[PDB]
């Protein structure tokens, strides 16, 4: 008794006003947007989309292979180009709440951007106890605009890599291969330089608990580096100073 | 389930839309 009408349950399907809001926006950000909407909506001709399966690992599977499969799962959700934000992410939520969201993201299987990927990367690597995970944020400048981008830094047995999502191949995944944290960060700085972006700020998070019931928040801004005020060698030493206060804390 | 059908329709339309927007973005 009691037909389900669970207004507190999230997930697709979404209401008709929200649905229109996306298509209205699509006509605005695409040259022939109205024709895109007309052709996609109602067409009985749309491909089926499979739900990506979250990888499962044998206990003997090495951590670098697990990282590649985790990054690949994150990629097959696809980068969100639709104009919409599909998930509301409050960065000050307790980790346990952020992990509920990550699980929901795996069940809804919608496109994502950089922050969803960071959340998913933590969720999907909590089960790897020898892997340290910590967010890395970049603020860049280009052509009259400031841009913000975040990835999940990782450390496996002394080597630094990264999981993430970006429109650019060189601004996300990095295999755990760098010997130092400054090499990982300078690698992202070079990739930004390739596209004439000026790196203004690097924010280094603290390492994130592996306990998915943890009520602690993520420390997103444990170290903040003003790269232009630092120069070059003070930058490298401040990065190595955070990494040591990361391995001792 | 008519809700399940609406769900699958919306998600299918979301990814078709994302396909078109990626093609626009990647060619620029």
Residue numbers in the entry:
A (entry chain A): 56 to 304
B (entry chain B): 26 to 53
Authors' account:
Vasohibins regulate angiogenesis, tumor growth, metastasis and neuronal differentiation.
The overall structure of the complex was similar to previously reported structures. When we measured the angles made by the Cα atoms of Glu71, Pro68 and Arg64, the heterotetramer was most extended, with an angle of 112°.
